[PDB]
Design a binder for this molecule. Structure first.
Ligand SMILES: CC(C)NC[C@H](O)c1ccc(F)cc1
Lengths: 237, 300
């Protein structure tokens, strides 16, 4: 059934699974028209499909052209997401296809289930976790590739960089969710923390800076301060 | 006018014949029901006074044979049987009538209720869902499960209702996933009406048949089927105008006849609220919506 705090280590066992987040698939700016009405303009989006054990990220870029002449876009976005995830699965060798797909929003369950009818043995699961994957577009390199795309495009990343050489998947996922939670609660502060020290750089083939083990502990501590803070600044405590 | 005689009534029992029901006391001199209208299917059904568990009964059509009821003390129930000796049967019936040991099927002349509930229900068609080919009548009870229930265990005792499943390859054309899930017209009109049922008459009859088994026997799988067939129509943007008009009449009389005190279990809030207020056909069921709002405004 649903994925929650109780069954959390299942993410890091040896059954292939993907998280799918559709938050950033349909993205708009809202603006005024010459007549003083309101209109939306779409910008490029992305599906965030992530293997939490390996860090492999299948970033399907959603170009604004896919919405042209369509109605009820928020609803279409869920079905387009399910179509693209189903296409991804079919593109993978049988031994790489997931055994479970966990959707971060419950409204993806039926669209994905219908698109995956050919795969009755792939479990489609919700989650009770409030995961911060919407903040993926706060990672500069991911945002850049989405905004520059001129056509539909899939781009493959490892969202853990090389961390798995030194830490376990569980620890890597915990670091990722903390970084993304921070970027979601206060993007400017989060990014300041990550870059304050000009001597620590982001490798061309990485997303995050090349912190030593010690510096990660400092960084992680600064991100938890930020999150508790903003939680004060927000609630006054 | 036809007759279903009873050999005897050895155990106290409430007997239903269609929408009517009366009480028979243990060893009361009761020998059957007469004046049963010809031209309709009928159901005769039983609830024992000592064990309200298991309502059970028999669908039949007097045009297809001479039928009677006889209690079996080994299996502990009233059984329907066919008498093949026509002279013997007329004799039995005439003697019981002369002794006025039969109750009078109380049809009021103004009253079209039973016709309206069974307009597309036929004994030969009923046999395709309740399989027991050696008899002309069909047994149903509270506990019997449907073929679809058996998929999610004795197949000879199953209701082979047509299986409907909105998240199934049969319902969803490859490449039309969103279209077909949100507008079920192709599943209704091509898959079900043109391919399986053959026409609207067969679709309506199974739907009427499902309701009556839910109402008279509390058969949960039949209730699921009735709501499933209804939802499939209401969730189709493209339905023949004649079907919608007839559906509104069918459901009106079904809601009209439902015991007020059983609405809690026999009516699915989600289906009805979706059908009457959200679906494509939200404006096409005027009589049904009016009776639902005046009789069960709580469910909504
Ligand atoms: C069997 C095939 C699907 N058409 C017939 C339909 O099932 C049906 C119709 C009327 C009934 F009283 C019972 C069942």
């Amino acid at each position: 059934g649903a994925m929650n705090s109780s069954n959390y280590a299942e993410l890091f066992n040896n059954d292939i699974k993907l998280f799918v987040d559709d938050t950033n698939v349909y993205r708009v700016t809202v603006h005024k028209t010459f007549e003083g009405n309101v209109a939306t303009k779409a910008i490029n989006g992305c599906i965030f499909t992530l293997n939490p054990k390996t860090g492999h990220l299948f970033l399907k870029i959603i170009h604004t052209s896919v919405w042209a002449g369509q109605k009820r876009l928020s609803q279409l976005a869920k079905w387009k997401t399910a179509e693209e995830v189903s296409a991804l699965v079919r593109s993978l060798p049988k031994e790489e296809q997931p055994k479970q797909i966990i959707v971060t929003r419950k409204a993806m369950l039926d669209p994905l289930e219908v698109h995956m009818l050919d795969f009755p043995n792939i479990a489609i699961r919700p989650t009770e976790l409030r995961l911060p994957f919407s903040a993926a577009m706060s990672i500069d390199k991911l945002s850049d590739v989405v905004m520059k795309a001129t056509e539909p495009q899939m781009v493959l990343f490892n969202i853990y960089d090389d961390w798995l050489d030194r830490i376990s998947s569980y620890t890597a996922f915990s670091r990722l969710t903390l970084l993304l939670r921070a970027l979601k609660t206060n993007e400017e502060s989060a990014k300041m923390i990550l870059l304050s020290d000009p001597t620590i750089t982001i490798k061309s083939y990485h997303l995050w800076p090349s912190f030593t083990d010690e510096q990660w502990i400092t960084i992680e501590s600064q991100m938890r301060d930020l999150i508790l803070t903003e939680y004060g600044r927000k609630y006054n405590v | 006018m036809n007759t279903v005689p009873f050999t005897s009534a050895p155990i106290e029992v409430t007997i239903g014949i269609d929408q009517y029901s009366f009480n028979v006391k243990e060893n009361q001199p009761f020998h059957g029901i007469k004046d049963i209208p010809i031209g309709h299917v009928h159901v005769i059904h039983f609830q024992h006074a000592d064990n309200s568990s298991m309502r059970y009964g028999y669908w039949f059509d007097c045009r297809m044979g001479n039928f009677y009821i006889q209690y079996d003390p080994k299996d502990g129930l009233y059984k329907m049987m066919e008498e093949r000796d026509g002279a013997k049967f007329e004799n039995i019936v005439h003697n019981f009538k002369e002794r006025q040991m039969m109750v009078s099927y109380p049809k009021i002349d103004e009253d079209d209720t039973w016709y309206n509930l069974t307009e597309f229900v036929q004994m030969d068609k009923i046999r395709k869902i309740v399989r027991k080919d050696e008899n002309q009548f069909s047994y149903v009870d509270s506990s019997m499960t449907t073929v679809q229930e058996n998929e999610l265990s004795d197949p000879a005792h199953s209701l082979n209702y047509t299986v409907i499943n909105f998240k199934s390859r049969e319902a969803i054309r490859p490449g039309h996933e969103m279209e077909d899930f949100l507008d079920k017209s192709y599943y209704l009109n091509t898959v079900m009406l043109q391919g399986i049922f053959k026409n609207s008459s067969n679709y309506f009859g199974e739907l009427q048949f499902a309701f009556l088994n839910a109402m008279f026997f509390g058969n949960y799988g039949s209730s699921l089927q009735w709501h499933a067939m209804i939802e499939l129509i209401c969730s189709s943007a493209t339905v023949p105008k004649h079907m919608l008009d007839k559906l509104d009449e069918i459901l009106y009389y079904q809601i009209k006849t439902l015991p007020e005190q059983y609405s809690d279990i026999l009516l699915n809030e989600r289906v009805w609220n979706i059908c009457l207020y959200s679906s494509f056909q939200k404006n096409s069921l005027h009589n049904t919506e009016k009776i639902m709002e005046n009789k069960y405004p709580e469910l909504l």
